[PDB]
Amino acid sequence: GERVVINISGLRFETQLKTLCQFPETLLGDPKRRMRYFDPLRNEYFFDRNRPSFDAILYYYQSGGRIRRPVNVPIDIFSEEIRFYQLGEEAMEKFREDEGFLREEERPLPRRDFQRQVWLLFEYPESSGPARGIAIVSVLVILISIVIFCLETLPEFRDEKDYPASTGASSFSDPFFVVETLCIIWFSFELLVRFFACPSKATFSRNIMNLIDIVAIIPYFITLGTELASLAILRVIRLVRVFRIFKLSRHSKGLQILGQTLKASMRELGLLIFFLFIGVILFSSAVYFAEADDPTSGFSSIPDAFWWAVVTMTTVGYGDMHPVTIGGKIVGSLCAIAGVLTIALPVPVIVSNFNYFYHRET
Amino acid sequence: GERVVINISGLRFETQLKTLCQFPETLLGDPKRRMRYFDPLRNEYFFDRNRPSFDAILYYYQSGGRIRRPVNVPIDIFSEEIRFYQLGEEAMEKFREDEGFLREEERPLPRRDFQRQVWLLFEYPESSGPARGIAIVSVLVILISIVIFCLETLPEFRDEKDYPASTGASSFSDPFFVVETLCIIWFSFELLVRFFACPSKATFSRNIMNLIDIVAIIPYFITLGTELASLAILRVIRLVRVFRIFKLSRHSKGLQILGQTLKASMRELGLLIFFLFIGVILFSSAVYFAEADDPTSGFSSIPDAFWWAVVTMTTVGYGDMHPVTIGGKIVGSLCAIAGVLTIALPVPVIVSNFNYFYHRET
Amino acid sequence: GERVVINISGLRFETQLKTLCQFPETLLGDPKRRMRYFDPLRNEYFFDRNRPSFDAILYYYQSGGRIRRPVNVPIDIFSEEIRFYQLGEEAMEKFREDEGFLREEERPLPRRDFQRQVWLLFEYPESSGPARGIAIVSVLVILISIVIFCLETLPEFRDEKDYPASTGASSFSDPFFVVETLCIIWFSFELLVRFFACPSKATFSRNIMNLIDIVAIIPYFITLGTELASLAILRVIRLVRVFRIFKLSRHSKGLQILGQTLKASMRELGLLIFFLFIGVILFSSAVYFAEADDPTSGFSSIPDAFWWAVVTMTTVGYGDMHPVTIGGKIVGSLCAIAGVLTIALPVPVIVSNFNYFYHRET
Amino acid sequence: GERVVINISGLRFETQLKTLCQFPETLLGDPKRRMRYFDPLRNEYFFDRNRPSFDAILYYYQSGGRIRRPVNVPIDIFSEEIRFYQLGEEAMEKFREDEGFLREEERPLPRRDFQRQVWLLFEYPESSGPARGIAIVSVLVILISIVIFCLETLPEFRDEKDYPASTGASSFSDPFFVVETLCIIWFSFELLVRFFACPSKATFSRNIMNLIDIVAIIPYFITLGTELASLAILRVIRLVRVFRIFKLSRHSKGLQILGQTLKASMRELGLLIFFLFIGVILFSSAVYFAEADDPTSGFSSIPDAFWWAVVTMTTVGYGDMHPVTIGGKIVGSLCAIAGVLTIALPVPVIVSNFNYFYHRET
Amino acid sequence: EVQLVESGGGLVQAGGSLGLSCSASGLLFSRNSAGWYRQAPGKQREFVARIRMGGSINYADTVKGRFTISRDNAKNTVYLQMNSLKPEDTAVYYCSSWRTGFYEYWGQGTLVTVS
Amino acid sequence: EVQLVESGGGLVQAGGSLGLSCSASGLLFSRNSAGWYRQAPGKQREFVARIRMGGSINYADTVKGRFTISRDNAKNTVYLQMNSLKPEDTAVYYCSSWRTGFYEYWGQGTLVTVS
Amino acid sequence: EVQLVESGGGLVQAGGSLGLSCSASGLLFSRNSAGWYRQAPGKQREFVARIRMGGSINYADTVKGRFTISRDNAKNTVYLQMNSLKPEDTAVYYCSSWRTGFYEYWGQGTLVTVS
Amino acid sequence: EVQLVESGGGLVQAGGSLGLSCSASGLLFSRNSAGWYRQAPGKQREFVARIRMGGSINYADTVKGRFTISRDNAKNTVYLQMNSLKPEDTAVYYCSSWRTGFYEYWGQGTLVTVS
Ligand SMILES: [K+]
Ligand SMILES: [K+]
Ligand SMILES: [K+]
């Protein structure tokens, strides 16, 4: 096997001709390209380039594909070096893959002339002027919907309906109803246009923010339908109307990062709740059995010290009651300490995941 | 001493023949194996391999055994390099030893035909279908045992026995007793089979989860025995029945990691409780002597401000009372600050130990 | 192109003559300076200097300006190396730029003889003896101004004016007024001298501490003016007098670092308040709908559980009330946990910014 | 200047003869020692040793003394390398100085035969059997002294002296007095022997634990003296008796590390208390001016919301009262958040100092 | 589980003066709206008074200025002070406390008939 | 350390009306079950009433509809209102408060005999 | 929204003894200063008493030693005990509670005239 | 700043029955020990009773079984119930509340002399 000597700035690197021909379309392998740098006087290919990098670009030839950056070569000087050597776009994506950088930007505009134009208007708000106008209008509509959900429960507004029941009306006299119907009109129109102008109708019931739009529309329609057509469903439907607060995540990049963080960390949250349940059983049992004898004590059950154990372990506050025996006080100081000890353990994993997803936007 | 020149990719490394013969069974030392790579034309052994690694593999020959990975060679490229050089399995375990990786997987199945088959059924739940069935049944039995321990203390169920004592019955009328006996039947049968089918009966009273099974069986037997055969033992025995919550650790890999973390960090927990005791004495004494003169104050002792000092330092809450003097308020703000200052100091050691034992499963 | 071989301690580095003449005023490029080191016997320029550094000083010549320190050469040995090679002050500032070190010390004393001398007296307190005297007097004046703002509201001092209104006086009988006027006299004189002796009068309404001085002077003048010349402005003006506490930041280097930290971290604080608002809506709605049926419960509105949700999520304390249903207790333990989970997420960014600005003084 | 070529394992390092003679007593400089390694055949000094290290040992010769370890050579391989090269103990201490390791072990036993023997008995408890006996006796005496300080204040013991004053006695009838005198007898004897047997009487009033012994002895003597020979001193002297809890630090290595941590971090604690004072003024003023109008509110002063501001910012608890206005509630949620934001900022510096002083024992 | 018991009834003559009381357990009145309802013989119940939680009192036209409804806010007690009773009053009375949208509770009844 | 003192006794004639009281200190009744027990001359004690903590009242057959047991839940006081006393009642009465499985406490006794 | 109602008035003869009361809702008196003011016919109001919050009582020269102002600090009630009333007292009285710099509230008036 | 005022005095005949009271402000009695002291004419004060904080009552030999000292623990009030008064009782009485080692406070005095 004949040998080839390449001299990158005085540093002689040597290899067998077979190794650099494994990849033949590359700069060193291609006979013609490499011929330019060759110097016939000393039988060596002189190049003037970074010394620490050309070591990694000979490993790729001798290892059938692996591309790993030396830890003392900065990213920019390496990216340029794969380019001069002509290792190919497959190679540079693998280098990006080894530095683990997200590479997905797939935006298939339909390109049917009108479907594409209105999709550009309604999806990407930075594109135009009316796109930012539509973003501002949607955020203000969501905000007044939240304000109607909370101000409908205030006793001051309902002064004349505050009478015993034994004595959503379409009478259009209640102002909360007509402003609520205007909000649901806007949500329905916006969702139907985003359905009919999308470039992928099969994938539309896959994105989670679309399923947030649907479950925000639903309960007003089923209460209107059953009203102009139950008592178990009504208390559930009145609390599925709180999900319009999560429909404010299409316009925020902080709520979307908290959704990625809470998806990618479910094992840690399960460990958090499991450790809490263990500690609550243990400490509530010990305080019940160390304070039951005292005639002036208040713990009357083991499933009655649970709330005391929860608010003492999480350093919140009072509990239902407070220990009055010397023994209850020793099991209450151990409970206070063990609480922060057992809830601070899985939290650094969660904040590290957030910090990663928070800087990956950059 | 004759000298040998080895050229790993243009980089000439030289050593005395004696150094590479110290270990004779290895690739460089064995005369025949090394003869293949030798090139007689220039009297050098040409190899085409990583440059940063072959430096460490010459230190092993010149240092009688030390094997340390350069910090700029990734783990995979090094592991492969010890293999090509043929340094032996003793060498690769030492490299694993220097990266500190747990190497123990000792599972001595007895191999007596039936003892081994049922041991595979009862110990390793992933092996079969009935093994996962047995795991699911054991977890559900433990859960209903916890539910009986807490629902036996609720005043609503015991409406007719709520009479003055002056007026565990085997009458089989109390439903809690018969479901409790079914749970202890299942625990006893499962423990006795894990005793008689184990491959090491001498080591069976060494594993901690086995001693958890025994101390979960014990108090029901001694109360049945003494009932059909004390008043000091009864209040202790009623609280040793809370250890069935720790018998749920054979089926969780988060409780086992918290047990390793709390074993390997006892000096830090001792420092935590010691610092707390110092601060409680100091601040309770200062608030007693800075508020005793006021006729409307409530601290009547130094061992009466202890509970106030504990719940103020740990940022929980009320305390028995609250300062009413200007001086009590200055010693109560210093107490609030010094509490978090003196309990946040030993905690990063504990969370670092948890994080280590938590990723070592991977 | 003729080639030049430079031997830094046995290590031969080679380059084309054109590359080292790109920068001609430098040591290697200048023919005469480089001629001293040249050895005609072997046609190489021998230097005795650090090996790891001379690699980076050849990249600068071959890369048109980039200067990056290898990660295994300590700062001091590199700073000296750019000096021996004579790369120029533009080069050494760029090296400081790449280690990101603040380089701004622009103090334009006016140099008009008297304006410069009194500016040195009043601005830089370390310069003299009377400068530290003036610093000590200003800090004591600010402190007694804060003491007058708080002791003017104590009911004990105002025993004879505690009469119904139906029955800032310049009568000079109220001692708080005359000591207040002395403090505002000192602030006005000090600000007017710092105006008339400054070397840049156009930039004087740009520094934030100057605008703190102005808004601390303002409300006493407008209340004196309107008194010897409203009922909406009076309650606002009485709270813009609290900004004299921020006028204590010219004499502290910890308040100035907290101002830099809170300026450079506004996106994180916005994320903190946004996450809090989301959690407060969600958990207050769930506790209102899970406790409204009980006739002895106290939550009468969704905008009535907001304060309970805030003080439970931030682990402060009581809330307006406490859950009394099994369902309110499950939504109150989830609220306690999710509070610390959602407020501990943006905080490491803020403490990292503080730690950076806190050590950059060194 | 003649040149010398040293070949450490194939790697040729070259220098001028003058550089390696700067230090003449060293291995390379000494002509005779270096002559052994010299090989006359190729005029080079062959050595078989680590390649990455010999680079740093040539910098020491060319830089007049600097010794810095390359970051990719482990500590042990370097320590050995300075030894083979014979750089001297001054050099190895400087290497230890650059890795910053504490080097002080100065124990000047007096060596006067008896003073040295009893000093070994009383100072270093690991030396003998009676030394550990004396350590155990001293710790038990300190513990019962703390128990007498707290149990002397309990109302149950003083049943017959609980009479109006108008109607430390040496009557020896009070058991607390005689056990207190036994404790002060033991402290006095132990301190006087540690005075008269010390090897440095001039430095004895410099060590802080000795001044702890003196200020623990003092108040019993001055109350006995003034009793058998004031009303302002008596309430101070009764609280200087709490320093016997700090006399337990000679026998603990955790209290001594907390003393080093709290000494080396006083600027951070000053910043903590300063930030707290700023926030307390700001938030107590804003809640007083946002709740004073309501006729049912309770804040009657700005120096009356101080305690509410302190216990709300530090997430402790109730405060004197709680906001009842919409405006008080907005200034109370901002107060709760800004509290943890402004007290979590200087704390990582303190825990890093503790972690450093805590592992430096190893 | 909850109960609304009341007293103070009977018969009265012209120009009388009387005070019915409503008490309950299983239901703090501090937290719920309440009122007194009467049912004349022959028609459906009409309202004597309403004290919506928060101290807002409203009365029907017939009892204006002759009737007062007060929650002692202590002892879970609501008391009505009727005055100068007239023969048109003759009726049977009832007590109640409810939360709009969730629950409604009644008393057993206690009558006052004016001669 | 704890004590249960009671009053209201004596003798009564046919169709009487009376009210014994039980008070204690060292024992909040807010937190413990309580009852009134009587002991006729010649047989063992029987129960007049029981108010298990939580407001669940049960009475024996003899005193049904003529007796009420109430805990004012204030002043650590339990009061029994006996009514239309009959000669079969003649007996000595006792008071108690206990936690099942932990403690039992009695009064000294106070008698009511019906003529 | 807030109200100050008062009673106890009328006419008295020489050497009388009487006690007016002031009660309010929408205003805890525990937290606010209060006093009683009278207005003789022909001149402006003078002060009978003042109890600044914190228990500091001061009276004018005319009523010294014959008058006491007390806040039961319970039931949001301030009571004045007038004694040995004299004909110079003849006047109309008023009640008040205020915070200096923020708010001032009055009663409707209730008179005591001495014969 | 603090005061101890007392009432209930006068003169009584043989076999009387009376009850002095001690009240204070600036001093919750819930938190401090208290007692009643008397001073017969001609010798120094002796003690009638002592109720150390925590309900431990002790009396001197002369008043045993005829006297009771109780802290209503409400209204900052301590009440003594004297019984069957005898002529040896003739004396002037005083009230007190103190913390051993810190403070001692007295009443003005209020006398009970037995005929
Ligand atoms: K907390
Ligand atoms: K708290
Ligand atoms: K609290």
Instruction: Write out the DSSP string of F31-75.
Output: GSEEEEEEE-TTS--EEEEEEETTTEEEE-STTTTTEEEEE-SST
- Both tokens of D221, joined, read 């003597």
**CATH number of the CATH domain containing B323:** 1.10.287.70
- Both tokens of D125, joined, read 């408890």
**CATH number of the CATH domain containing C43:** 3.30.710.10
One domain for residues A160 and A203: yes
Cβ partners under 8 Å of residue A122, min gap 6: A131, A134, A190, A193, A194, A197
Alpha-helical regions (H) of chain D: 17-21, 31-37, 51-62, 75-85, 89-98, 115-123, 130-151, 175-196, 208-227, 233-237, 255-263, 266-289, 306-313, 326-343, 347-359
Place of tokens 């370890």: D69
One domain for residues B147 and B242: yes
> What is the CA(D340)–ligand 1 centre distance, in A?
10
Q: Are A103 and A93 in contact (CB under 8 A)?
A: yes
Contacts of C161 in chain G (CB under 8 A): 100
DSSP label at A286?
H
Nearest-by-Cβ selection for G52 from C162, C165, C166 = C162
What 3-state class would DSSP assign to C318?
coil
- Both tokens of A33, joined, read 């390209």
> What is the CA(A279)–ligand 2 centre distance, in A?
19
What distance in Å separates the CA atoms of residue B119 and residue B136, rounded to the nearest whole number? 17
Give the number of other Cβ atoms within 10 Å of residue A222's Cβ.
13
One domain for residues D119 and D247: yes
DSSP label at B178?
H
What distance in Å separates the CA atoms of residue B295 and residue B169, rounded to the nearest whole number? 56
- Domain end point (choices D98, D126, D141): D98
- Both tokens of C96, joined, read 């400081």
CA atoms within a 13 Å half-sphere pointing along the CA-CB vector of D132: 4
Q: Kindly provide the resolution of this structure in angstroms, with one decimal.
A: 3.2
Interchain proximity H103–B296, CB inside 8 Å: no
Domain count, chain A: 3
- Both tokens of D269, joined, read 């604690």
Residues with CB under 5 A from ligand 3 (ion): A 317-318; B 317-318; C 317-318; D 317-318
* Burial per residue of A173-202, b for 16 or more beta-carbon CB atoms within 10 angstroms, e otherwise: ebeebeebeebbeebeebeeebeebbbeee
Structural domain that includes position D16 = 3-98
Contacts of G60 in chain C (CB under 8 A): none
Cβ partners under 8 Å of residue D282, min gap 6: C242, C245
One domain for residues B131 and B223: yes
What 3-state class would DSSP assign to F2?
coil
CA nearest to C307 within chain D: D329
Contacts 24+ apart (CB under 8 A), A352-358: A353/A261, A353/A264, A353/A265, A354/A257, A354/A258, A354/A261, A354/C345, A355/C348, A355/C349, A357/A257, A357/A260, A357/A261, A357/A264, A358/A257, A358/C349
What distance in Å separates the CA atoms of residue H44 and residue H40, rounded to the nearest whole number? 7
Q: Are D335 and D322 in contact (CB under 8 A)?
A: no
Find the farthest-apart pair of alpha carbons in chain F and give their distance in angstroms, rounded: 41
Identity at A346, one-letter amino acid code: P
Interchain proximity E53–A159, CB inside 8 Å: no
CA distances (Å), origin B154, targets A295, B147, B148, B238: 18, 11, 10, 15
Interchain proximity C15–A7, CB inside 8 Å: no
- Both tokens of H40, joined, read 């017969």
Chains that touch F (3 or more CB pairs under 8 A): A, B
What distance in Å separates the CA atoms of residue C24 and residue C61, rounded to the nearest whole number? 10
Cβ partners under 8 Å of residue A57, min gap 6: A81, A82, A85, A87
- Domain end point (choices C39, C71, C98): C98
Cβ partners under 8 Å of residue A267, min gap 6: none
What distance in Å separates the CA atoms of residue C306 and residue C287, rounded to the nearest whole number? 10
Interchain proximity C252–D274, CB inside 8 Å: yes
Please check whether residue D108 lies inside any domain of the structure: no
- Report the DSSP pairing between strands F46-52 and F33-39: antiparallel
- Both tokens of D82, joined, read 């300075």
Q: Are C19 and C33 in contact (CB under 8 A)?
A: no
Domain count, chain G: 1
Place of tokens 């050995």: D80
Identity at C350, one-letter amino acid code: I
Identity at F61, one-letter amino acid code: D
- Domain end point (choices C252, C276, C301): C252
Please check whether residue C188 lies inside any domain of the structure: yes
- Report the DSSP pairing between strands D44-47 and D3-8: parallel
**CATH number of the CATH domain containing F14:** 2.60.40.10
**Residue D15 bridge partners (DSSP):** D4
What distance in Å separates the CA atoms of residue F94 and residue F105, rounded to the nearest whole number? 11
CA nearest to D20 within chain C: C48
Interchain proximity B343–A345, CB inside 8 Å: no
Nearest-by-Cβ selection for A297 from F2, F26, F31 = F31
Q: Give kind and range of the element (H or E) at residue C144.
A: helix C130-151
Q: Give kind and range of the element (H or E) at residue A132.
A: helix A130-151
What 3-state class would DSSP assign to B188?
helix
Query: C–G contact (≥3 CB pairs within 8 Å)?
Result: yes
One domain for residues B245 and B130: yes
- Both tokens of B12, joined, read 């000439």
Sign of torsion over alpha carbons H21, H22, H28, H33: negative
User: ∠ CA(G92), CA(G96), CA(G98), 5° rounding?
Assistant: 155
Question: What is the end-to-end Cα distance of chain G in Å, rounded?
Answer: 37
* Burial per residue of G57-92, b for 16 or more beta-carbon CB atoms within 10 angstroms, e otherwise: eebeeebeeebbbebeeeebebbbebeebeeebbbb
**Chain D contact for B329 (CB, 8 A cutoff):** yes
Alpha carbon dihedral H10, H13, H14, H15, in 10-degree steps, equals: -60
Structural domain that includes position F83 = 3-114
- Both tokens of D241, joined, read 């008796």
Give the number of other Cβ atoms within 10 Å of residue F114's Cβ.
19
What distance in Å separates the CA atoms of residue D339 and residue D311, rounded to the nearest whole number? 9
Instruction: Write out the DSSP string of A81-101.
Output: HHHHHT--HHHHHHHHHHTT-
> What is the CA(B311)–ligand 3 centre distance, in A?
10
What distance in Å separates the CA atoms of residue A79 and residue A99, rounded to the nearest whole number? 11
Please check whether residue B109 lies inside any domain of the structure: no
DSSP label at B70?
-
Q: Give kind and range of the element (H or E) at residue H97.
A: strand H91-99
How many interface pairs between C and E have CB atoms less than 8 angstroms apart?
A: 21
Interchain proximity A164–E98, CB inside 8 Å: yes
What distance in Å separates the CA atoms of residue F9 and residue C33, rounded to the nearest whole number? 124
What distance in Å separates the CA atoms of residue D88 and residue D74, rounded to the nearest whole number? 20
- Both tokens of A172, joined, read 């259009």
Nearest to D77 by CA among D50, D115, D45: D50
**Exposed/middle/buried for C272, CB within 10 Å: 0-12, 13-18, 19+?**
buried
One domain for residues B247 and B272: no
